[PDB]
Structure 1
Amino acid sequence: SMKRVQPCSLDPATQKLITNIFSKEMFKNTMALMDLDVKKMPLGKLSKQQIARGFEALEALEEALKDGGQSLEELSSHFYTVIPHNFGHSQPPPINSPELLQAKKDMLLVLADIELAQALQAVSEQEKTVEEVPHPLDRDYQLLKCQLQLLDSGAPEYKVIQTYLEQTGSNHRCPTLQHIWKVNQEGEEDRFQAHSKLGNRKLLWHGTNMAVVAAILTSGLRIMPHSGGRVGKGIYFASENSKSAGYVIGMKCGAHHVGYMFLGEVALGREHHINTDNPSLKSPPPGFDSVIARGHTEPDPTQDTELELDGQQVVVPQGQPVPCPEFSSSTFSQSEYLIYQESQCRLRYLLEVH
């Protein structure tokens, strides 16, 4: 007996979002862009065990890169058996530098979130027994356990967000704003309230691959054991959209290019400012609640405004980037804002940009 498929409750923009972030073609494209062999690693075959084994292989490479152990070649080969790569059916190359090691760790962190999205979609037994099912897009939305509310252009914060995007995005080829959703992942509310005493809150950009958007909506921005970069093992944000936009892996759809970007509220508290890379950081120095790798520029602070989110003032930059003489010799062209506790960020908005 045929189950009834109930009509979709979602508006068109939301249906498109949900289609995009769970799209098998998107996920496979992402795996291709990371040099993975999708024929040998289909989406349905991806497992938590394999990803675990991949990290163990990288852990061994990291120890060798830092005594008669296996060579980097041998240790690479193991990694490529565990995580099949496609390089024109030539031999994949050896992971013999800290840069390439972090690149592979980052690839696996993406792949882990792809596997999360597949595991999220497994059909439950409650679903097999009920006689009516939600529309596939309603089902996928409900799986996120995340409220998304589409904003119209007269919403109080809409202009402020658009101005942030426009003023701090690329000057020549700015991303074009298509939609904004307010994001309310509950489960986030309470840990974030923990930092209510922490003044210095700012709304900051976080760009990602489209393949990790579902994972973020389900679980927030995360720090994992192999997370890394120029400012160590934290969650990275930018005050300049153009900086975060560099991490947006968009996807060709029709004649346009679709990308998604988050705005998070970050409780920065007492800021420690640095002007040189430190990939070894795992927390701010004692007494500090965040690390800001200060750029040569910063959105002009005289133009900052504020939005009231859950009764707290949150700074939102509105200015074009201006030079900061004190940091003119920084190793950072643009600032990177780091937190080292997941609880210091609350997702607030999701933007679709073309």
Structure 2
Amino acid sequence: MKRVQPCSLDPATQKLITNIFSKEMFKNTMALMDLDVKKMPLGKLSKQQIARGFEALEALEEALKDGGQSLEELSSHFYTVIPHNFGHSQPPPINSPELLQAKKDMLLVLADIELAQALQAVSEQEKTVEEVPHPLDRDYQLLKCQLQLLDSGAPEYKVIQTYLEQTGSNHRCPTLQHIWKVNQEGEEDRFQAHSKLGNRKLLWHGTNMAVVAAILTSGLRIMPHSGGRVGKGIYFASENSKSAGYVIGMKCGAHHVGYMFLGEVALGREHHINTDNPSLKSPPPGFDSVIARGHTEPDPTQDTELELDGQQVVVPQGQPVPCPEFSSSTFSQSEYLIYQESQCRLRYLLEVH
């Protein structure tokens, strides 16, 4: 029998690792995306299945753009590959660009669920080694990402807290529980190359809980089949309320639990837009970012700065105020886009109730 070594983690980090590696949380997410968890168990989920899923969605995309199969014939093949559960009734046809991108977004989450499952596989070295770490230490070690819990006294604590409270829902106030500094090793070098590229900003990136382990393992990515209102890049917001909309919040006890990322984004020369462009794959030449400007913006006169690795990083601190220039924008709130993974570094992780 193998000796289980004691857990080295603080209670808040243990709780976080318990939450983001939880089998029930992953199944819950699949259930919330109307996936058939009985026909698709966590352990049966595979890279081949997800690939076959995206192949079926691409065929549907070609039909949506000949004498080929009908949209219902092609939809039926997608549901055979990715079993859904609509109370065991006939699943609906994927006959619109809005339905298609939603199905792609579902598979991107499912790919991050499969990645967390693949990450937890027992290596041959582990089978030979005569002791084992506590399961939470093992999961933490697999992320290959340093997490450091901040106390109310850390220099950035009050700055982050003000950012959260001033730009979050005025009535549906997100309650801050914990902040971890995130040091993803193998993400430092690519981001540091952009040292001469300024206009650095700390921006929100909200996700569901089932993709947090994959992000701590791999960083924010520009995945194939990804997209949205401002194309194929990494989406950020300066308003917490915009990023919070993407946080489902899992029920636990008498409260909700969710996680939010803060990323350091080197925006450099910004290109501003006031209308949707799902076809963008990069900024225009000579630009380093695309900012879909909203009707509001956290009061720029209230911006502060944080020193992160000897670089000034703008941190908004004001409530949203109107922006007359973008009063007629198709965006109510700003969306910040970068099209190179190296222009982002994860910096903080927040637990919110």
Structures share a fold, TM > 0.5? Answer: yes
Gaps of 5+ in 2: none
Q: Deviations along 1:89-116, whole A, 9 cap, x unmatched?
A: 0010000000000000000000000000
Secondary structure at the aligned position of 1:263 is classed as: strand
Alpha-carbon distance in structure 2 between the residues aligned to 1:260 and 1:33: 17
How far is 1:327 from its partner?
0.2
Q: CA RMSD in A?
A: 0.4
- Give the alignment of 1:65-144 within 5 angstroms: 65-144=64-143
Alpha-carbon distance in structure 2 between the residues aligned to 1:256 and 1:125: 40
Alpha-carbon distance in structure 1 between the residues aligned to 2:57 and 2:193: 35
Q: Deviations along 1:185-221, whole A, 9 cap, x unmatched?
A: 0110000011111110000000001000000000000
How far is 1:59 from its partner?
0.5
Count of residues in correspondence between the two structures: 353
Q: Which residue of 2 aligns with 1:169?
A: 168
Secondary structure at the aligned position of 1:194 is classed as: helix
Alpha-carbon distance in structure 2 between the residues aligned to 1:159 and 1:272: 31
How far is 1:131 from its partner?
1.1
Q: Which residue of 2 aligns with 1:200?
A: 199
Alpha-carbon distance in structure 2 between the residues aligned to 1:187 and 1:3: 32
Secondary structure at the aligned position of 1:214 is classed as: helix
How far is 1:151 from its partner?
0.2
Alpha-carbon distance in structure 2 between the residues aligned to 1:163 and 1:332: 24
Q: Deviations along 1:217-249, whole A, 9 cap, x unmatched?
A: 000000111010000000000000000000012
Secondary structure at the aligned position of 2:24 is classed as: helix
Q: Deviations along 1:246-267, whole A, 9 cap, x unmatched?
A: 0012100111100000000000
Alpha-carbon distance in structure 2 between the residues aligned to 1:338 and 1:196: 19
Q: Deviations along 1:293-328, whole A, 9 cap, x unmatched?
A: 000000000000000000000000000000000000
How far is 1:184 from its partner?
0.1
How far is 1:129 from its partner?
1.1
Alpha-carbon distance in structure 2 between the residues aligned to 1:92 and 1:270: 46
Give the percent of matched residue pairs that are identical in Structure 1 and Structure 2: 100
Secondary structure at the aligned position of 2:16 is classed as: helix
How far is 1:173 from its partner?
1.2
Alpha-carbon distance in structure 2 between the residues aligned to 1:129 and 1:253: 37
Gaps of 5+ in 1: none
Larger CA deviation: 301-310 vs 125-134: 125-134
How far is 1:273 from its partner?
0.3
Q: Which residue of 2 aligns with 1:327?
A: 326
Alpha-carbon distance in structure 2 between the residues aligned to 1:302 and 1:186: 34
Alpha-carbon distance in structure 1 between the residues aligned to 2:68 and 2:271: 40
How far is 1:276 from its partner?
0.5
How far is 1:174 from its partner?
1.0
1:262 and 2:261 matched = yes
How far is 1:75 from its partner?
0.3
How far is 1:125 from its partner?
0.9
Q: Please list every run of at least 4 consecutive aligned residues from structure 1 whose deviation after the TM superposition is greater than 2 angstroms.
A: none
Alpha-carbon distance in structure 2 between the residues aligned to 1:174 and 1:244: 13
Secondary structure at the aligned position of 2:261 is classed as: strand
How far is 1:335 from its partner?
0.1
Alpha-carbon distance in structure 2 between the residues aligned to 1:24 and 1:333: 37
Q: Which residue of 2 aligns with 1:8?
A: 7
